[PDB]
Structure formats: structure tokens, C-alpha cells
Design a protein around this ligand. Structure first.
Ligand code: HEC
Ligand code: HEC
Ligand code: HEC
Ligand code: HEC
Ligand SMILES: [Ca+2]
Length: 114
């Protein structure tokens, strides 16, 4: 399927405004992960490899936007999908790849959020 242009991820609206973030994400920058269907499945992990690809926060997925904890572990929350220790999350993949210092994205909170 079509690989999107750069976006700003902004699904969450932390009532503590100092901890509200709008986070740039580039499919193109992530091309080193691959461009085949399996590459897409490294993140779109429930995708069947054939259908339309959609967002992470639909019904039955990571739809709950009411936890604002970076340490959230319940997968029903969107925070978990971007932060958990799993290699499918933003923070989790970058940090797992950093285990033997493979080239990867930002691991620090502020460097990723900007
Ligand atoms: C290091 C420990 C942290 C901490 C404390 C937080 N983050 Fe992140 N973050 C990332 C993405 C893609 C989002 C989604 C933004 C959105 O959809 O609006 C967030 C969001 C947050 C929040 C909520 C922000 C809000 O607008 O409500 C909070 C409180 C938060 N984070 C804390 C992405 C990343 C990273 C990318 C690799 C990394 C690293 C971090 N976050 C790290 C941290
Ligand atoms: C492999 C080549 C692909 C393809 C074909 C797509 N992706 Fe991704 N993608 C990722 C994240 C976190 C999002 C949501 C960002 C947000 O919440 O704004 C997306 C989004 C998409 C879309 C749009 C879906 C929608 O309607 O919102 C599409 C069409 C899409 N992707 C296709 C994250 C990743 C990855 C993590 C690094 C990787 C790898 C891929 N995507 C790979 C692919
Ligand atoms: C969009 C690209 C994403 C991203 C970044 C993540 N998901 Fe999912 N996810 C879903 C379910 C039911 C689970 C639980 C495990 C399972 O039953 O397979 C998960 C798991 C995750 C994790 C791990 C969370 C943890 O630390 O335990 C992560 C980091 C993650 N996902 C990220 C459900 C769905 C979907 C339903 C079809 C869709 C679509 C997505 N997730 C999309 C994404
Ligand atoms: C969840 C939506 C995210 C977000 C917000 C980011 N990442 Fe990744 N990332 C991965 C790798 C291997 C790289 C290095 C690519 C390379 O240089 O070859 C990156 C890079 C980034 C960046 C930096 C982009 C740039 O312009 O240099 C940023 C801002 C970033 N990421 C944010 C690997 C992964 C994953 C492996 C499965 C996962 C999941 C994510 N990244 C998820 C996210
Ligand atoms: Ca936000």
C-alpha cells in the first residue's frame, strides 16, 4: 500500500499543557526498516499484509486517549502503543535497537517530542 508523507502525530491532549506533545513522524526516514509488507508489520502489527492500512487508535486497538502516563502498560491506551518496552512502540524500538547501538531514532523524551 501507499507509504504516507511526513505527518505530525497529535491524538492526545494532555490537560497538563506543559506535557502535551505533537510529534513528527516520517515514514521515509524509517525506510532502513524495509519497504516490503513485513516492514510495515514491524509497526502495523495487526495488518493482514493486503488490506488498507489505518491508524493505531481505532476501536479494538489502542483507542483510549485518557491515560497520559509514559509508563502505561495497558495496551488499550494509545500511550502504551508509543511508549512501552515493546519493539513495536516508538520508545521501545529505538531503545531495543540501542542495546547493541544499532543506528536508530531518538531514545530521550525531549529529543523525540521536540
Ligand atoms: C520519556 C520517558 C517520555 C515521557 C515521560 C513521555 N514520552 Fe512521549 N510521545 C511520543 C508520541 C508519538 C506521542 C503522541 C502524541 C500525541 O498523539 O498527541 C507522545 C506523547 C506523550 C505524552 C502525551 C502528550 C499529549 O499530547 O497529551 C506524554 C505525557 C509523554 N509522551 C511522555 C513519542 C515519544 C518517543 C519517540 C521515540 C519517546 C522516546 C517518548 N515519547 C518518550 C517519552
Ligand atoms: C510499509 C511500507 C508501510 C506502509 C505501507 C504504511 N506504513 Fe505506517 N504508520 C505508522 C504510525 C505510527 C502511523 C500513525 C501515525 C498517526 O497516528 O498519525 C502510520 C500511519 C500509516 C498510514 C495512514 C493510516 C491512517 O489513515 O492514519 C498508512 C497508509 C501507512 N502508515 C502505511 C508507523 C509505521 C512504521 C513504524 C516505524 C512503519 C515501519 C510503517 N508505518 C510502515 C508502513
Ligand atoms: C499502529 C502503527 C500501532 C502501533 C504503533 C501499535 N499497535 Fe497494537 N496491539 C493491539 C492489541 C490487541 C495488542 C495486545 C497484544 C496482542 O494481542 O497482539 C497490541 C499490542 C501492541 C503493543 C505492545 C504493548 C505492550 O507493551 O504490551 C504495541 C507497542 C503496539 N501494539 C503498537 C491492537 C492493535 C490494532 C487492532 C487491530 C491495531 C490496528 C494496532 N494495534 C496498531 C498499532
Ligand atoms: C512512533 C510513531 C515513532 C516515532 C515518533 C519515531 N520512531 Fe523511529 N527509527 C527507527 C530507526 C531504525 C531509525 C533510524 C533510521 C535511519 O537513520 O536509518 C528511526 C529514526 C527515527 C527518527 C529520526 C528521523 C530522522 O530524520 O533522522 C525519529 C524522529 C523517529 N524515529 C521517531 C526505528 C523505529 C521502530 C522500529 C520498529 C519503531 C517502531 C519506530 N522507530 C517508531 C517511531
Ligand atoms: Ca498531543
Amino acid at each position: 500500500p501507499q507509504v504516507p508523507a511526513d505527518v505530525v502525530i497529535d491524538h492526545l491532549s494532555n490537560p497538563n499543557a506543559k506535557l502535551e506533545y505533537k510529534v513528527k513522524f516520517s515514514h521515509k526516514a524509517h525506510a532502513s526498516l524495509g519497504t516490503d509488507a513485513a516492514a510495515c508489520q514491524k509497526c502495523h502489527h495487526k495488518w493482514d499484509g493486503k488490506s488498507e492500512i489505518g491508524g493505531c487508535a481505532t476501536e479494538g486497538c489502542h483507542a483510549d486517549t485518557t491515560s497520559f502516563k509514559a509508563t502505561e502498560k495497558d495496551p488499550k491506551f494509545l500511550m502504551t502503543a508509543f511508549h512501552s518496552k515493546s519493539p513495536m512502540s516508538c520508545q521501545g524500538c529505538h531503545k531495543e535497537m540501542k542495546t547493541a547501538k544499532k543506528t536508530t531514532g531518538p531514545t530521550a523524551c525531549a529529543q523525540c517530542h521536540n
